[PDB]
Amino acid sequence: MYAVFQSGGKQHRVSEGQTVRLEKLDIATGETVEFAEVLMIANGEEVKIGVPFVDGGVIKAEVVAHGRGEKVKIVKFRRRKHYRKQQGHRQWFTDVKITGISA
Amino acid sequence: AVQQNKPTRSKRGMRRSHDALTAVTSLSVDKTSGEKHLRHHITADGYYRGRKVIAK
Amino acid sequence: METIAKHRHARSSAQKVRLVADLIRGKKVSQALDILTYTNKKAAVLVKKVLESAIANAEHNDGADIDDLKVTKIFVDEGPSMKRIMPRAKGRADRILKRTSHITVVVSDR
Amino acid sequence: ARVKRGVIARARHKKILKQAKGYYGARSRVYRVAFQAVIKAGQYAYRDRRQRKRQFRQLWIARINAAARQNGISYSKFINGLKKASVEIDRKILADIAVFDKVAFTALVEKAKAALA
Amino acid sequence: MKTFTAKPETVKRDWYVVDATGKTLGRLATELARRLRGKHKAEYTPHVDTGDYIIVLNADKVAVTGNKRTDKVYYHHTGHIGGIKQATFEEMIARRPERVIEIAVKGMLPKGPLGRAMFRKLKVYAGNEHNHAAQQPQVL
RNA sequence: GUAACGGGGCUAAACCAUGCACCGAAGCUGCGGCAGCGACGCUUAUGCGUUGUUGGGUAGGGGAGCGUUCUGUAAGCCUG
RNA sequence: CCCGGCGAGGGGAGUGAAAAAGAACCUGAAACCGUGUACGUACAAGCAGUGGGAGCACGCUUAGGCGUGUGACUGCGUACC
Ligand SMILES: [Mg+2]
Ligand SMILES: [Mg+2]
Ligand SMILES: [Mg+2]
Ligand SMILES: [Mg+2]
Ligand SMILES: [Mg+2]
Ligand SMILES: [Mg+2]
Ligand SMILES: [Mg+2]
Ligand SMILES: [Mg+2]
Ligand SMILES: [Mg+2]
Numbered sequence A: 001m002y003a004v005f006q007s008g009g010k011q012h013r014v015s016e017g018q019t020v021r022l023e024k025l026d027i028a029t030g031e032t033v034e035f036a037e038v039l040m041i042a043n044g045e046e047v048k049i050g051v052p053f054v055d056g057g058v059i060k061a062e063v064v065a066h067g068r069g070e071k072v073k074i075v076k077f078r079r080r081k082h083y084r085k086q087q088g089h090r091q092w093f094t095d096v097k098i099t100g101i102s103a
Numbered sequence B: 001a002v003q004q005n006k007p008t009r010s011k012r013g014m015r016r017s018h019d020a021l022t023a024v025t026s027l028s029v030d031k032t033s034g035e036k037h038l039r040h041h042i043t044a045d046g047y048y049r050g051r052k053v054i055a056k
Numbered sequence C: 001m002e003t004i005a006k007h008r009h010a011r012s013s014a015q016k017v018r019l020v021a022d023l024i025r026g027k028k029v030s031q032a033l034d035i036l037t038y039t040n041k042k043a044a045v046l047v048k049k050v051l052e053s054a055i056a057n058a059e060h061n062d063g064a065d066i067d068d069l070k071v072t073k074i075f076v077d078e079g080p081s082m083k084r085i086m087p088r089a090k091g092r093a094d095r096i097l098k099r100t101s102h103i104t105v106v107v108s109d110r
Numbered sequence D: 001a002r003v004k005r006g007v008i009a010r011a012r013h014k015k016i017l018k019q020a021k022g023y024y025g026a027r028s029r030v031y032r033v034a035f036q037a038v039i040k041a042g043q044y045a046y047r048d049r050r051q052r053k054r055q056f057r058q059l060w061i062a063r064i065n066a067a068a069r070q071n072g073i074s075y076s077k078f079i080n081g082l083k084k085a086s087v088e089i090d091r092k093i094l095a096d097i098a099v100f101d102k103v104a105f106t107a108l109v110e111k112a113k114a115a116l117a
Numbered sequence E: 001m002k003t004f005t006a007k008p009e010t011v012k013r014d015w016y017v018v019d020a021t022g023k024t025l026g027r028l029a030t031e032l033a034r035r036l037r038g039k040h041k042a043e044y045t046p047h048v049d050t051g052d053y054i055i056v057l058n059a060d061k062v063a064v065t066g067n068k069r070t071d072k073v074y075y076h077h078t079g080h081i082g083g084i085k086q087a088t089f090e091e092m093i094a095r096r097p098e099r100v101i102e103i104a105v106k107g108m109l110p111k112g113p114l115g116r117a118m119f120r121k122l123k124v125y126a127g128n129e130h131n132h133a134a135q136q137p138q139v140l
Numbered sequence F: 001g002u003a004a005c006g007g008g009g010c011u012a013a014a015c016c017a018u019g020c021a022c023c024g025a026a027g028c029u030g031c032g033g034c035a036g037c038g039a040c041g042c043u044u045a046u047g048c049g050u051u052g053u054u055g056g057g058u059a060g061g062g063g064a065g066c067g068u069u070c071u072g073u074a075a076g077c078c079u080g
Numbered sequence G: 001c002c003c004g005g006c007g008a009g010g011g012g013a014g015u016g017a018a019a020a021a022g023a024a025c026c027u028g029a030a031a032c033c034g035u036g037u038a039c040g041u042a043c044a045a046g047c048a049g050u051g052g053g054a055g056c057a058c059g060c061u062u063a064g065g066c067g068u069g070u071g072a073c074u075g076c077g078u079a080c081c
Helices: B015-018 C012-024 C042-056 D004-016 D034-067 D075-082 D094-100 D102-113 E101-108
Strands: none
Touching: C012 C042, D004 D034, D034 D075, D034 D094, D075 D102, D094 D102
C-alpha cells in the first residue's frame, strides 16, 4: 500500500520506503514509542481501492519505526556585497529516518 | 582594419581544418610493377610501350 | 634506446607533420617509402629521412637487420617556435611564430 | 619593503582562471574572462536557482492540468475540490502521481471531482 | 543520483487513430501536437528525442468557428522574387488537404530539427477508412 | 516587412451582468537560522531559551575580521 | 659505435646522484602550437553561458538509482571599461 502525509513538508510520497523526515522534539536516539501517523492516508491508495480520499473510513495510520535520527549535511552558503561578506555561516537539521511499517 | 582581442588557441585551430593535405592513389602500369606515378605509364624510361622519350 | 632517431628544429610546424605521421605506424619499416614516398607534403620528406636514419640505427645500436622491425611509435612534439614581426595595419596584426617539431621514430619487436 | 606582487599576483588570476568549462576562447585563456564572465556566471546563477522554484511548479501544474483534466474537471476545478478538506491537502510536487500511480491520481481526481460541491 | 530519465532514443511508440471527421478542426491540433511529444506520456523525458504515433483520417470535415471557412491567409511564397506570393483562402485550399490545414500541427511543433522528426510522420489522408495506405496494424 | 490583439488563433478564446472555483509576488503563513532593541523565563559581571518586533538603500559614518612580508615568543617546533 | 653530405640533427654506449643537468644546459609557469584518446557535431541562426536534460565513454557499489568527461534537445538571454 502507498503512503502519504505532511508534517514539515508533504514528504510521504513513497510507500514504506524508510526515508528521512523531521525530528522528534526533546531528543533523538532511536528505539521507538510506536507513533501512528494520521489518516492522511491515501486510503493507503494501494489496491483495487485506490481512493480519491485518502478518507476511506476513520482511523488509518502507520507506526513510525525510528530507524536513525541523526547526521547533518553542511552547506557553506555565503553572501557578500561589494564592501562586506557574511561569508562565514552554517545551519542544519538531522531529519530522523523512520522506516514506517505497512499502511 | 585593425583587430582587437584575438584567441590564438581554439579559433584558427578550426580554420586549420580546411588546411590538412591530401592523398593520391594510382597504379603501377603493366611494365613498372610500382612507380607509374600518376596517370603516367612509367618514368624509368618514359615509355608507355616503346620508343617514347628513351627506351629499347 | 630501442633504436630511435627523432629530430629537432628544421621547422615544419607540429600539426603539419603530425598529419603525415598518422599515415605510418603498425607495419611500417618495410614501408620506408611508398606509404611515404608517394605522398608529397613537406612533412613527408622530413619523416622519411629520419625514418631511414632510424631503420639504419638497426645496424649499429642493435642487430636485427632491416627487414623485420615494426615502428610501434611515431609522435611529433611542439618544438621552440621562432618569433618575427609583420608590417601590416600600422603594426597591430603582427606575431608570426614559425613553429617546428621533430618526429621521433621507433622500431621495436612485434 | 617588497610588494613583490608576484607573490599573490599569480594566485588570484589562477583562482578565477580556474573555470574548468573553459567556456570559449578568451573566456578561460585570458584574465579578461573573470570579472567579465566568471562574474556573469555568478549573476546568472544568483537568480536562476531561486527563480527556478517556480519554473518547475509551472511544469508541475502543466502536467496536472494535462493529466487531471483528461478524466474530468480541469486543473482550475481540481485544486478547488482538493481545497475542501479537514486534513486532505497534500500539495503538488509529488503531484506527479500521474506518471507512476495513475490509479492513485485518477483515484485522487474523484477526491476532487466528487468533492466539488 | 542525477534524476532525469534518459533518452532511450524514442523508446516506445503507441499507435493511434484519430477521426478528424469530427467538428473541432483547429482545436484538435493541440491534443495532436501535445501527443507527438509527451502529453499522455509521463516518463520519457521530452525536450530530447521522442514522440509517439497517431494518424489522421478524412479530416476533410472541418469548418472552424467563424467565417474561417472563408479566410486563412495561406501563401507558400517561393525563392522567386519577381513578385510571387500564392495566397489562397482556406476553403480554396480545403479542396485538397495537403501540406497545410491538417498540417496545422507543423507550426505548433518545436520546429527545425527533431521537432521535424514528428512532423507529417503521423500520416493524414482524407477519406477515413477504405484502402488505408497506412500501416493497418495495432492502433486505437 | 504582417507591424494599430505580443504571435498563434478566436463568433465567442468579444462585450455586459451574476456568482463560484483555480493560477498568481521576495506580500502574508508555515519551518530553520543570524543580528539589534522591549519584554518573558529564569538565571543573575553575565548569560542563555521563549517571545514581540526591526533588519531595500550609492556618497558616507561605525564595527569586526582574513590572508600576505617583516619582529618578538624561537638553537623552541617542523624538515634531505 | 650507428644513420647522415667525413652536414645539421639524432640514436646507443659511457661520465654523473641525476644528461627527465649535454653545453639551447637550475627551477622551468603563461600566451601560443601540436599528436593521442572519450563524447558532441554536416537542416541549423545571435555575447556561446546559465537552468533543465537524455544518450555515450569510463568509474560505483553484494541494486540501492550515484562520481568524472562530453554534452543532443529545451526556458532564458546584446561582453568588460
Ligand atoms: Mg629548406
Ligand atoms: Mg594598434
Ligand atoms: Mg601584486
Ligand atoms: Mg520536469
Ligand atoms: Mg506563492
Ligand atoms: Mg570578516
Ligand atoms: Mg567519436
Ligand atoms: Mg567529483
Ligand atoms: Mg554586438
